[PDB]
Every structure is written in C-alpha cells, then in structure tokens.
Design an enzyme around this catalytic site. Sequence first.
Site, short mmCIF file in Angstrom:
data_model
loop_
_atom_site.label_atom_id
_atom_site.label_comp_id
_atom_site.label_asym_id
_atom_site.label_seq_id
_atom_site.Cartn_x
_atom_site.Cartn_y
_atom_site.Cartn_z
CG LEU A 1 -2.27 -0.75 1.17
CD1 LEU A 1 -3.15 -0.34 -0.01
CD2 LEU A 1 -2.11 -2.27 1.23
CG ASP A 2 2.18 5.23 -2.47
OD1 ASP A 2 2.87 5.57 -1.49
OD2 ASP A 2 2.22 5.83 -3.56
CB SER A 3 1.63 7.35 1.93
OG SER A 3 2.18 8.11 0.87
CD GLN B 1 -2.25 4.05 6.00
OE1 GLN B 1 -1.82 3.01 5.52
NE2 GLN B 1 -3.05 4.08 7.07
#
Lengths: 208, 156, 176, 80, 291, 114
Positions: free
Chosen positions: D38-40, D43
């Site tokens: 997961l990338d931020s 997020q």
Amino acid sequence: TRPTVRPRNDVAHKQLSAFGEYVAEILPKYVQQVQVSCFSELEICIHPDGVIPVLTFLRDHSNAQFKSLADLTAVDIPTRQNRFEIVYNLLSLRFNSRIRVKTYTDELTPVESSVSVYKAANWYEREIWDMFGVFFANHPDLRRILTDYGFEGHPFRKDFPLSGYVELRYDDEVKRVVAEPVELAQEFRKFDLNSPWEAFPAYRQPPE
Amino acid sequence: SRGEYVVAKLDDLINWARRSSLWPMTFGLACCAVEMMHMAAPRYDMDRFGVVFRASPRQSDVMIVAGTLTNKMAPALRKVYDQMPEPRYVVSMGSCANGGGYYHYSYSVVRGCDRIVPVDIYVPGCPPTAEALLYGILQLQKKIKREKRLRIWYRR
Amino acid sequence: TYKYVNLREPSMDMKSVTDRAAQTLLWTELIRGLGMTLSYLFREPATINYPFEKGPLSPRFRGEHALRRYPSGEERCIACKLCEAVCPAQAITIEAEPRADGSRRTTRYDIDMTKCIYCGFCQEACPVDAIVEGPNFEFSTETHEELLYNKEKLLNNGDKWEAEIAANIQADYLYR
Amino acid sequence: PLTLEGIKDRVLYVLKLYDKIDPEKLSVNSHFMKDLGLDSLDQVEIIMAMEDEFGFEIPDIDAEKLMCPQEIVDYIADKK
Amino acid sequence: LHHAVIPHGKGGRSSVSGIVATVFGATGFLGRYLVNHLGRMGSQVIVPYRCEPYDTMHLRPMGDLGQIIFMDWNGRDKDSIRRAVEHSNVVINLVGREWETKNFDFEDVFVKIPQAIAQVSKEAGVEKFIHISHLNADIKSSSKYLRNKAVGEKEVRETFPEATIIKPADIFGREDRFLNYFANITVKQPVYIVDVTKGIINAIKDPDARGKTFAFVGPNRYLLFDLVQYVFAVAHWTTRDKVERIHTTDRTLPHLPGLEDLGVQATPLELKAIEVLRRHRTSEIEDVQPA
Amino acid sequence: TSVKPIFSRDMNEAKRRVRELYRAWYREVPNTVHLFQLDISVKQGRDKVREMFKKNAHVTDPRVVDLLVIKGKMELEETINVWKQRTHVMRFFHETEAPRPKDFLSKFYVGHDP
Ligand SMILES: NC(=O)C1=CN([C@@H]2O[C@H](COP(=O)(O)OP(=O)(O)OC[C@H]3O[C@@H](n4cnc5c(N)ncnc54)[C@H](OP(=O)(O)O)[C@@H]3O)[C@@H](O)[C@H]2O)C=CC1
Ligand code: SF4
Ligand code: SF4
Ligand code: SF4
C-alpha cells in the site's frame, strides 16, 4: 542642438539628485542604486527585504508624501540569477514628482503582502501572480484574474510562446467546447530586424 | 398545379415575414459594440426596417457577434446561442470576429467565431462603417428572400 | 483656477421654500422636461434613407484593397515586400518569381480581409503607390472562402474602377 | 451497545468492502504498507474513508501514524 | 501518385489528412457524426445536400476553413452526381428514410440510387466505395425495408464488386430514433454511435480491410423489455411498420468479423444512456442480460 | 547561499500539506460531479485525480511542492464554487483523440514524430 530637441532642465535634475542622496542617507540599509535619468525621474534599485518599511516610510514622513501608486510589473528578463523585477511606481499629490522603486526577485522569492500598506495593490498583486507566477507572501486572497480558469502556464513569461498550447473549438460528438493542440493556418513569419552598426555609441558595454 | 402556386405565394409570405422584422440581440464586446450602437443612431436607423434592438435572447432573430471573442468568453457564447429559437441567423461583424484578425496570434483568442457558431454573413472592417453593417443586413435579408423552405418541404 | 460645483444651499426664505415645495408637489420641472422633448418632437428628423442615399465620406477614406497598374501598362507592384514588412496583422503574403522577360514580378500576393485592420500602412509604404485603399465598403460575404483575396481578385478589383482612385490620388499626392 | 468488538467488526468489513486490496489477505497487525503493498496515497484514502463512514475528525498526523488495522481500531478505542 | 494526397503532420483542424470523402446524404444523424470524425481527422468532406441551406448551415462549421464543400444533388439525375464525383478519392453511400413519402418510398431508392452512383464511381475511378446496410437485412418477410436493403447489398456486390458492405446494428446516440420514440409514450443488441463511426473511419484509413464485408455487434444483446425497464428507470411519427422492424429479427452473423478484429473498442449501453437520458423533471441500473 | 522558505521547512510538511490537499480533492469530486451533471463515474474521476497526483511524484524540493499546494488549492477553491463551468471541468480530461501509442512503427507510418 537647440531646435526640434526635447530640452533638459537640470534644475529638476539637481533637486531630484539631492532628494536621492537624502534617501540614500536616511535609509542606509537596503540601497544599491539611486539613479537619475536625463529626462529626470527617480529610480531606486532595492534589495527585496525592506520593501514594506520603504513603503511605510515613503507613504508618510511629511517631507515626501507619495500617496499615489501606479504600475508594478516584474518585467521579466533572463540572464540574471534574479529574473523578475517588481517595479512599483509612485507620484506625490503635493510635489509633482515621480519615483520608481524597483526591487529585484527570482522565480521563488516573494514579497510580503504589500497590499496592507497600499490598498490599490490588491488586483495588481493578484494580476502579477496570475500572469507570471511571482508568489506574493501572506496576501489575504490570491485568485486568477485576466486568464481563463482551465488555462495554466503563466503566459507573460518568455518561455510561453506567442500562441499557446491549448486551443478551443466546438465539437458535436459530446456537444461541447473542447481543446486541442494549437494548429495554425499561417506561420507568423518572424522577422530578424536586428541590423548591425550600433545606432547608440553611448551605451557600449565592454567585452571580456 | 394550384397547390404549387399556393406553395409559392405562401413561401413568399412567410419569407417576407421572416425578413421584415428581424429584431436582433447585440452581443457586442469591444468597439464593434460601439459601432452597432452607432448604427442604431439617428443617422442610420435600424428602426426604418423594423429591426429593433432587444436584449431578450429567447426572442432574438439574428445574433450579431461583434468584438474580440476569447476562450474565457466562448462557453458563455454558445450557452447564449443554444437557448435561442431554431430560426436563428448569424452575422459576424468585425475583423476580430470573422477570422480573428488583429489579435490572431495570441492565446485566448478563438480565431474567428467560425469555431463556435455557424456564420451566415461575414461583414469585415475594423471597425466596419455603420453604413456597411446596414448593407450587410440588407444582403442577409436577400438571403432570407432566397430560402425556398416551403418548396423543399413540399417536395421532400 | 478651480470653478467647482454645488457649494450652495437652498435658502430658507419663504418664497424659496414654497417654490421648491411647488416643484415637489406640482411636478413642474418634470413638465419642463416634457416640453423639451416635445420641442424635439416637432423638429425635422436627422436621418438619411440608406439604399438610395449613401452616407458622406472623405477623399481620404480607407476602403477596398485594390491593386493598381500603370497608365495602360504593367502591374504597378514590384513585389518589394514592404507592405508585408509593415503590415501589422501580417495579412500580406508575397512570393515573387521573376517573369519570362527578365523583369521582376510576383507569383502570389494575398490579403486576408479577415485579418486586415485597414490602416493604410501599406498605403503609406508602397513606394510606387500600387496598393491603394478604395472608396467603398461593400463586401458582406456569405462565405469564409471568399475573404482571402488573390492577385487576380485584387487586379479585377482594380479593374472595377480607376477614375475613383485617380481622383483620390490627385487629391492626395499633395498631403501624402 | 457501541462497544469495542463491534467497532473492530465494522472496520473489518469496510476493509473487506474496499476493493483496491486484492486479495482480501487479512492481517490486523499487518503493517500493510510494505508487506501488503500500500502506498501512502491509499493510506490517506483508507483513513479518511473511515472518517467519512463513522470516524472522528481524525487529523492528518494521526492519519499517518497508524499504518495498521488493529492499531487503527485501537486509535478509535483511544477516543471512542 | 500526385502530391497532397500524402498527409502531413498531425490530424485535424488544418492538419491535412490524406483522404477525400464524398459523403452522400449526411444531413441526418450518422453521416453528420461521420463528418465530425472526418473534420476531427482534418479531411476534405465533399457533401451534396438537396435541401434548404439552413440544415447544412447548422452542420457547416464542423470541418475547417474550406475543407468542407457543399453542392446540390438529387435522387433522379446523373449529371449532378458526375459533377459531384469529378475528383474524388473515396465515397460512402448513406441514404435512406424510415418512412414513406408521396414521391419517394422504400422502393427505387435502395434499388435505383446505389446502382447509378456505383456505376459512375466505377467509371470515374474511386477506391473504397463503402455502402451501409442494416444489420440482418435479408429476404425475410414482413419487412419491405429489410428486403430492400438486402437487394441493395446484392446490387452493391453486383456492380463495383470490390465495395465495402458494412452492417451496423441498431444504433443509439444523441439523437436516437427508437430511444426518443420511447421518450414519448427476443434479445436485442444496440451499439453506440461513436463505436460505429470509429469503426468506419478506421476501416476507411486502414487498408487491407477492403472488399470484405463487416458487421457490428452490440455488447449487451438482451431483451427489449429489460431495455424498456432500464430506460424508464432512468427516465422516470408512430407507424407500426417500424415496430415490426424492431420486433422481427435480432441475431448474430459469425460469417465475418466484428469490432475487435477491426481496431475499435466497444462501449456498452449503460454509460451512454447516462449521457443521453436527460429530462428527468423541469438510477436503477438493472441489465438482466438475456443471453 | 540560502532561500527564504515559502511555507514548509523540509519535505515532510510538504508531504503533509499535499496529503491534506488530496483529501480535499477526494471530498470535492462527488458532490460537484453531481452538481454539474457530467457523464463520468466517481471511480474514474477519482482515479484520474490520483493519477494527476502520480504525475508529479518525483519532485525533490519543498518550494515547488508548496507551490503545487498553492496551485491545487486555488483550483480546488474555484471548482468548489460554481465558477469553472462544465467546459473547463471536462477540459481537465482529454475527449479529443490523441490515440497515439508509443510504438516506434506506429509513429513511423505518419511520421516526423521523433
Ligand atoms: N435502424 C436504422 O434505420 C439505421 C439506419 N442506418 C442508415 O443510416 C443512414 C442515414 O440515416 P439517418 O442518419 O438515420 O437519418 P436520415 O434518414 O435523415 O438520413 C438519410 C439521408 O438521405 C436523405 N434522403 C432520404 N430520402 C431521400 C430521397 N428520396 N432523395 C434524396 N435524399 C433522400 C435524407 O434527407 P434530406 O435529403 O432531406 O437531408 C437524409 O439526408 C441511412 O441510409 C440508414 O440506412 C444506420 C443504422 C441504423
Ligand atoms: S474588429 Fe476592430 S473595431 Fe471591431 S472589436 Fe475588433 S478591434 Fe474593435
Ligand atoms: S509595397 Fe507595393 S510594390 Fe512593394 S511588394 Fe507591396 S504592393 Fe508591391
Ligand atoms: S491596411 Fe493595414 S492591415 Fe491592411 S494590408 Fe495594409 S498595412 Fe496590412
């Protein structure tokens, strides 16, 4: 040299010279140049820090009122590390004399909400920000004036060409106004009228 | 062919009725707006013809583009043009509007209003003479004399 | 010297206040405005019937963009490109072959009537007075095809009259 | 009624209902950034998605410092 | 060959593409959107209109400055047709009305017109003569329209046999016939207009796809009644000859390729119906999918 | 040499401001795309929004990322008001093909496109 030549009047040259020396003495801190042109309007070239103390001084002080504000443009030249020039222009209602306060900047260093000391500067600041991108710090409200909304690119820069990149038309597929890469019908035949032999030998820059 | 003779005279009647009144709306941005309001002056009456200025776009007859049409203007222009009744006729006045003209090579100038609306009568000039604009309205009225709409509907 | 307006109050004399109150309660100066516009009702109207009486002009009006020629002669243009060099909207397009008989000439001399701003800089700049603004202003063109003139359109436009431009150049070889 | 395990359950099935995580691949102490990819950007999408569903005001430094589903539910239990 | 049939640069709005399309009819719907894709290509549309100048005025600024050209024609003479196709690269044949008139009916337009224009086009030296047809137009009964278009297919195969016979499905677009017929009140596969006309322009600019007839497929193919459910779920001239035409035949023809063999990506009904179905007042997407 | 910073101190507050700005564009899309009645799914709009955030990811300066925060902030304000009409919001996309793939050969057929 007398007929059909706009005559100088060096009494005004001397008075504005004495005023410029007065200004350089009373504000020693932010002065690099106080030049006087031969057609006698004052130009003061300024480091971009004390611009708000300069304006709060030169709005007031009862020796030089200068209530009158005019043009501001950050006239863009390359070749300098600081590309842009904030060119404030001022006129005193009481004195009939025009001074220009030219401070320098580059593509990221701001000025610091000069609208709070000249109330006329609001759309001037928003204009220079929109047309160039010279961000002005701590200004209350920045928006876009004199461009389209969907347009971007800060068009008064030199890198922006004479035409643009988007171009509008009406398409009937989705029945609306759409944009395209710009497709001219004529060249805009650009002329090189820079003919040599130095029509002004007074301004010869020295070589290496 | 008494039906065709009735069709000919009835087409004549409705074409005379269309060309007779022709009350426009003045779109009118720049100095060509001043020239339109100078061809509504006493020395050149549109009101000799029954052509009456009216700012109502729900009853406009001919839309006169006049002035420097821009990108920021153009969606408002065709939103005006859409809510106009289906009998609509377009006069492009001025070198700004009939091909871009003096501000041709810049951003934010649509190169003439051909790219926005269809155009019936181009009239040039920067500014046009008021007298020339009146002549352009006359040649538009001769186009309205040449419609043969009812003949085409009769033999479609 | 300053001659400024409205430094005066309506004085509280009884006749002053009853005349101003009569102006209020009896609408008098309003009726004076009515009398003014009726005085312009009974005038003779200052209109002109257009399609039978065309409006007045000058000898120095700027019109039509015709090419001229010599007195029973060749094309007065030389393709020296000055008219493109000073045409501000750059509507002039010139391409110049020399012809068969050695003399220098054209191929293509084009004006965009869409683009032309009608200054007569080409009129002030053509060194032989070839391209001259005409008298008349009647194009009213149904197409965007026709408003791109070519050399034969301009020369036929110059063929459509000379005596007009003859009288105009005879009226303007003295000032310009 | 508004108890800890039901909050855990509803965070669990809205993480199920979120579609960009393929497969389900469920872990509560996951640190799902590096391990579950997961990338931020995703997020901040998930954290303000919880904020939109039933969350608190949820400021941005609290939005970054969680990174972990059981730790997210423990943040809600740190306030709720 | 001679120059200026080579293209130059990009495409569209004085970006000269290399085709010259003589388009018949086109004052209606599908020919108008095809003219729009050719102006978006930046080509030269030679269009004959036989009508008042006002309708061709409302389609006039679609192409660029002078790239369009307008001229008269008729469905009876020949000199006007030859004057139309004096200097043509390609020509597409799209003419036909869903209702009978006093002077012209379903017969002798689909039986006269492609014979004569195909004859003079074969004489005057064109390529890529593209003739349209309805989907599943056969000699099947109760459809004068379908049998006339089937005879038209047979005649276009007859004269100038190297012609592109195309058969698109029941099109829906911005100005649809049957959807707007539903607005005023057996599977079926409708296909959206830009899929069809992108397929047409790709088949006209991608040669080696020439002479072989092509068919278009609606990417739903479900019942008429579920489509009525969907269109009234989103939306809150009545001759029953049309209703036999829309009830009669709906099938596939695998004897020839389709969309993805051509270089064109389909778009389903739902998104385009969200586009065109306005007029709620002054979403229930069902799509039961029968086979 | 040194620079007067605009808003941030290092890349961290820049990332925090752009994060928050992306949250604001996330809560900007669905209400406005209902209000202007466009033709695009909320998934497609949001995914091209986060694509636009993916476009400028490699910027290594606090000043430029602050200036992009200013850009996105102004654009978000004038889209959350009703000023920027249907034309400009659809102009954010590309409904004018432009289908050109990056094949060397497909660029070679209609050429002079290096
Ligand atoms: N289900 C369907 O009906 C489908 C039909 N098509 C095809 O699309 C084509 C275009 O039709 P469409 O866009 O629907 O709308 P139109 O029916 O309006 O298009 C037909 C064109 O031909 C003209 N025309 C018709 N009859 C005559 C005649 N006797 N003489 C001269 N011109 C005539 C029309 O009128 P005018 O000359 O006044 O402009 C119009 O320009 C048709 O050929 C049709 O077969 C394609 C897909 C589906
Ligand atoms: S055509 Fe000339 S006169 Fe008319 S609006 Fe443009 S600049 Fe003004
Ligand atoms: S200035 Fe006169 S002679 Fe020279 S190119 Fe132009 S029209 Fe010809
Ligand atoms: S009148 Fe002006 S714009 Fe027109 S051709 Fe001459 S110089 Fe050019």
